[PDB]
Every structure is written in C-alpha cells, then in structure tokens.
Amino acid sequence: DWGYDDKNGPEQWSKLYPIANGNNQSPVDIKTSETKHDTSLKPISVSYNPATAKEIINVGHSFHVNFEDNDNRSVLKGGPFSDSYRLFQFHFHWGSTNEHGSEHTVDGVKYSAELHVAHWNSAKYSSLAEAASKADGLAVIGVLMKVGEANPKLQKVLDALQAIKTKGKRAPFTNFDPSTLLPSSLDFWTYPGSLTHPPLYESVTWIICKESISVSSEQLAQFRSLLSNVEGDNAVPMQHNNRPTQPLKGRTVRASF
Ligand SMILES: NS(=O)(=O)Oc1ccc(NC(=O)Nc2ccc(Cl)c(C(F)(F)F)c2)cc1
C-alpha cells in the first residue's frame, strides 16, 4: 500500500511498480540550456465550463477536485496536440516546508507546490480508464507555485477543505472554472512522461508553464493541515506528496517560446 512515508514512499514504489525505473518517468528537472524551441508548437487553448465541476474528495495522500467528463464541455487543445483532451480533475502537490514542494523543477530550483490540471484523449479513446495506459492518453498542465502573496483564486478551493478534513470525506464542489488558476502567460515546456505516483503509467504529455503562480505560506499550511487518517483515528497531517525528479533518459524537453 504505497504512500509518501519512508516505508511506502517514492524510493519503495519500484518493488510493486517496476515502471518507476522506466524511460519516461516524471517529474523531471527542466534544464533551460538543453530545451529545444519548436516552431511547430501551437499556443495552448483551454476552454472549461464551470458547470462541469462536481466534487472534492480527500484521498488520504492528497485531495482531488473532479469534473463531469461525459462530453466536451471542458477541453484542452493546441500546443503539441492534434486531438482535443477532456478535463477530468485538478489537484496539487506540496512539501513539508516552503523550500521544496513542487514536483517539476527548473534549472534545479524547487518551488513550494505544483498544480496539476489533468485531461484524457476523448478523440481516440472512450473513457479515462482506457486512455490511462496509452502513450498519448493523458495531458497534464503543470503550474509551479512560488511562495509569496496569497493567491485569491485559490480561495474557493481552500475554503472547501474544512468539509473534507479526513480520508474518504467527499463534498459537492460546483461552478468553478480551473482556467482561473492558470498564469496569464501560457508559454510552456512539453515532454513525454508519466503519472507522478503509482501506477506511474507512461501515458502523459506534460505541459509545464513557464510563469509561476503565487501561494502564501498560510495557504500552504492549509494543504498540510488536511488529515490522512480516517475520522476518529489519531490525526496524521498530510505533510507532503511530491515525487523526486527522475532521469530524462534521452528525452527532449521542447519550448514553445
Ligand atoms: N500526479 S499526475 O502526474 O498528474 O498523475 C495523476 C493524474 C491524475 C490522477 N487522478 C486520480 O484520481 N487518480 C488516478 C489513479 C490512477 C490512474 Cl491510472 C489515473 C489515470 F489518470 F491515469 F487514469 C488517475 C492521479 C495522478
């Protein structure tokens, strides 16, 4: 039963999930001197319908904000893609202190947290479950979160956490467009990689934003005050859930800028 503690964490994942040591693993350190600018990359186009927001849930190691994905009301297009990708979820990763919480890094610099906006290829596949193990199945936008000014756009999300404090609690979460969380520039890096936790499928085209967004030290504390235990058990704060960076193994990170 995988997690982020010393016994079940990222260094132990390879035992039940050998793909952990694979050739398209994520996250990575983006070295800007080694990126290749690609003129064939189109701008990123997001069009999300706030009516597709459904539910927020505490999953023990993190929390997820899920979207209705029965149709193309909320889609990602452009960049490296020929196909439309359908929004299904956003979530975050964070660390035990402000110094290190992001998953991706840029020129060795660790940020305080990271936003993942996840999508599946509904042009080619019939469901998320089908798309999840396909090399071209998933598209994730990653946004680096730099500790600084409180981010007001995060506040509906953070305000919802009090209703999902312990593992398995879920609550309705509606009328929210997650494009409001994205930076104003959508200049990006792209590379072929993986889910950053088990089952670690190498099915993700990553879109990493060049511009960070802000988060306050107190907003980060709200993440870390979520509880990994079930109600009635001893409180176990969700202190961190970020994977270390993984070897590029010859992959090319492309820049849109
Ligand atoms: N961290 S990451 O890099 O963005 O990766 C993830 C992307 C989405 C999730 N969402 C879940 O609720 N869990 C979840 C669990 C297993 C699988 Cl197979 C998937 C799927 F997306 F592949 F289908 C999603 C979990 C991890």
Ligand SMILES: [Zn+2]
């Ligand atoms: Zn993630």
